[PDB]
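Bench log. Compound arrived from synthesis this morning; before running ITC I wanted a structural hypothesis for how zinc ion sits in the protein. Inputs:
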Amino acid sequence: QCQDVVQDVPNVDVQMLELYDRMSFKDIDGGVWKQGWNIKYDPLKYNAHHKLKVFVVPHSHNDPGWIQTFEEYYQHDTKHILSNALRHLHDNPEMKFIWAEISYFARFYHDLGENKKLQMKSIVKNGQLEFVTGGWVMPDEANSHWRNVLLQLTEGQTWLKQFMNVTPTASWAIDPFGHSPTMPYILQKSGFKNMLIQRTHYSVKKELAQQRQLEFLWRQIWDNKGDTALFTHMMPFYSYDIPHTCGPDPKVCCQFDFKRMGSFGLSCPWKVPPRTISDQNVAARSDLLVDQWKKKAELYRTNVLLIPLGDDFRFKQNTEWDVQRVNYERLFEHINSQAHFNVQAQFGTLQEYFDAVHQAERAGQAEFPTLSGDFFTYADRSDNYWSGYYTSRPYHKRMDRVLMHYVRAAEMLSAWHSWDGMARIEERLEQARRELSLFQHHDGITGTAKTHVVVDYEQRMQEALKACQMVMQQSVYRLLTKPSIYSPDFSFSYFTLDDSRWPGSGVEDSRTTIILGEDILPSKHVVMHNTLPHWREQLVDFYVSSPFVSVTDLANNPVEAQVSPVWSWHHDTLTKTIHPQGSTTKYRIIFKARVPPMGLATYVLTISDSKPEHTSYASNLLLRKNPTSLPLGQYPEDVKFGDPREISLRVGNGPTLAFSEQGLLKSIQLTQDSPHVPVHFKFLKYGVRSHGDRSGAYLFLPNGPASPVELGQPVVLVTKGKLESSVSVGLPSVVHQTIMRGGAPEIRNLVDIGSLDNTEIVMRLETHIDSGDIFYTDLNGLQFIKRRRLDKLPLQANYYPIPSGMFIEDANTRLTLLTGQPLGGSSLASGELEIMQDRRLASDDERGLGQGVLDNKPVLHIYRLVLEKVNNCVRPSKLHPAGYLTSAAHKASQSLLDPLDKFIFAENEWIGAQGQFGGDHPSAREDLDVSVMRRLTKSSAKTQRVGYVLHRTNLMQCGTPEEHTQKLDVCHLLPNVARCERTTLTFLQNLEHLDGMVAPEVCPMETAAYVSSHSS
Ligand SMILES: OC[C@@H]1[C@@H](O)[C@H](O)[C@@H](O)c2[nH]cc[n+]21
Ligand SMILES: [Zn+2]
């Protein structure tokens, strides 16, 4: 039934880890094709009965923000490109154009008059204007979470289906900085049949070109049977621009970019300008161009050749449309009429190219190789590896993950009901999805935009968060209020969200204190939401104005709680120390919330005049020389002081953690009986080269291995409680915190790199795990891929994206670090893991940004650290390219990315309040998630429709006996189901009408989408 994703090593022609191990990577001068070789072809290959079919595909790369904001580019460039494309395509029926970025197309098309909308639909319908991919953006593939790649894809394709009546099945990704197999995974489950990529390491292009393996069936690394495969075309040369798309010699190809003759302020760096095609030169020019084409064709297996014709923000001026079109028309007329070339050349679209390739394949002209793996880390030349952007602008990388979860929660919470249009739910959700989708752009989450553009993205995401909160709190008020009492004002704020980790302590004082007092308000309701489809317990904390607070559930059952002080860290410019201060006006209360699957649970906080029975108080110990007092208002336990010393802590029956006198982990003991396993946290710094190429937002070019941060004698704060303990230390640039709640610790770093120029701060873990040169990192939060550190590559090439986690292991032991934000990282030596925290760079790195990275701001990075025994786990064989998390590590990742949401009732009395929502929801097996729940219909639809994306991961089997769990049938989550359909992941096509209206669960590592229809 399900394929085994662990025990069967797929047989593929190209496996990228294996290729990397055998490949040389030497950077030799290949001639005019600087990174290749002098291509030779047999003139007799093509003849009257076997012609080269050439598709020249005009395109325009439109960054939705980069050096200018989205709106700046729309006004200065893109609106003119699309307006002129409409006119020129309309007037020139054989001309063609492809378009990828639906954010801009939707921005344009809603400003069009109906006349022009009709003209636009007609050039789309007749095939002249073709959408490729059709996502909101062309997303980053390194840092983006798969859920947000799907979100943006769905945003763009839903728009296209509604307004243009088309759904692309060919993808175009010419600019992400390296490529991930998460894309063919999502695309193939979204109806796609073909995809194109460009930015892969120059050594890989050379190696695959030599074997004519640039077109391949790209399957997932665990996929033995190949049902995930998607036909992929990799472009062979250094750029998607015209000099690097006609053939191997850019000095020749630049002469066929007719925008470079001078009046457009562009030129050919190879010093030979384009010449206008005329009758007198067209034979000569045609000979030059066809020779480039036939050389490019030698790198591919069919007689169908793709020639992209475009560059950034091209096809803007009317004169530009004319100069490209007319000159190419003159070339085509001559070439196609001269039999000796045995070429038929024409403007085409991407789908036309792929259709002809597969016609050639079906006619037995070619068979394509199979490939698995990824295309990280990219280098475009020499040792210039693009691993910098795995970390650049980490504040916004973390914000991406926060907004990711708020969008899911807002869509899910509001999906349970139909809402009147006056509630503006659909409007607020559309804004939130679109701002998050825009940020998936390969200059958004990547941290490669200009400072003012990063500010625009942040402002947009802030508005999106506000939109999510609004939707979420209205939905909680409706879900938990007795129906005949529910009396909404859709503008009102019934609850506010409390988020302990965003923007996070010492990032902003954006947390509300619940103010209670005998003379004002005795108690407060709080509500937790659990977006995950299983019952979940999680400690939650709130700020309260008294330490004397007790917690009850909504059967008035006491709930055990712990109160701790509110500590904030300060750089004391007087004492020249980083040290904590305790609030004397507010306190933290912590308790375990238990919440139904996809549900809500209400608790009550009540003040009392003295210590409540079921509330305990943490002790606090400040370790530093020369201490001074730390009063804590009414907090009942006095702070203790001591000189720095090693300390050990244990919460519950969980691990025992030992810390150095500088407050950093040194060992973990899993059980009373077990060994203290060395696990040492260390902070180090990388610098920048004084000679040669400089690191910048894209590139990581360290001046050698990292050097330890000089820590001096830092102040360490130990808080010990029954429910939660922690060790926090004020290091230079980092307030580092280890938090213990009874299982794997949580690490929080408040990272403020300040004015440390040309510095990259890394967090490293040092262990005795005999990992050798192997480690594992995830791709887009979806899968873990085996990495091998290669000493034939420089340090920065051994850096990979860490979008959600990484691990190392040996036969017996594994250490897994889960992240709440994408960052760059590696294992640079056996037993080590490391992950970059922030980077501040004074210089530009020659990739077009025209600035360094000097706009850092404090960011709270969050992690879970899971040390496990794995000798009993059933793991893949040594040759398998994948790895898989354990249950504990997967749950720890979920605790970071989709924590409980916390709501505080905003007024004094909630009348009609209810205790729980969702208690009858099925509690699904732990490896299954409802990644998306989205109502797809507005309230006036007679047939309501709700879409669900179901993802099952694959967890390692390590001998924990399985317990029965309930089957989750998403189609019966809402009443009056009238139909259940399996759909593509965008919900845009029905694939199966399901028996009994039951949505089956999915196999490990698969993702499916279902839509339930309900009579209303
Ligand atoms: O070098 C990479 C940068 C990218 O950041 C932009 O997305 C891309 O469109 C572009 N054009 C020129 C230079 N660049
Ligand atoms: Zn771009």
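What the model suggests: Residues 672 and 780 are 37 Å apart (CA to CA). The pocket of glucoimidazole (ligand 1) is lined by residues 61, 63, 66, 175, 312, 442-443, 448, 847-848 (CB under 6 Å).
ITC booked for Thursday regardless.
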